[PDB]
Design a protein around this ligand. Structure first.
Ligand SMILES: [Cl-]
Length: 130
């Protein structure tokens, strides 16, 4: 069973990583469990997804949002690398053309109340929940 401090330690391994690593199967399981625990200790999450193609990005969006318990929409696509935002507080969701060099998912966990998590983690793997 995973403690909050353990979960944070796991996620903090990705602190300031611009490009998410390719993780082994059991590493992914640990990161999944850590992320799910931590997000229960926050009121909502905002996702920022950078991917080489719309398809990879949209797959990340659909799989993360499901594991986090969020409903999602169809976003129109663009050619080339993409950035996708999914705002869990106000429902904002969009896909843009992305000219940057990061890859993976940033998960901003926000809480209205002190004691709650107010941290951003990643970049975490696009395929973390695949
Ligand atoms: Cl970070």
């Amino acid at each position: 069973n995973l403690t909050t401090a353990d979960a944070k330690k796991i996620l903090n391994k990705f602190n300031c990583l611009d490009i998410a690593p390719i993780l082994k199967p059991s590493e992914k399981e640990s990161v999944r469990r850590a992320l799910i625990l931590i997000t229960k200790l926050s009121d909502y999450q905002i996702l920022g997804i950078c991917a080489d193609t719309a398809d990879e990005g949209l797959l990340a969006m659909k799989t993360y949002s499901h594991a986090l318990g969020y409903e999602v929409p169809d976003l129109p696509v663009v050619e080339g690398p993409v950035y996708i935002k999914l705002n869990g507080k106000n429902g904002l969701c969009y896909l843009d053309s992305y000219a940057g060099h990061h890859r993976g998912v940033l998960v901003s966990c926000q809480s209205y109340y002190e004691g709650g998590i107010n941290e951003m983690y990643g970049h975490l793997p696009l395929d973390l929940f695949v």
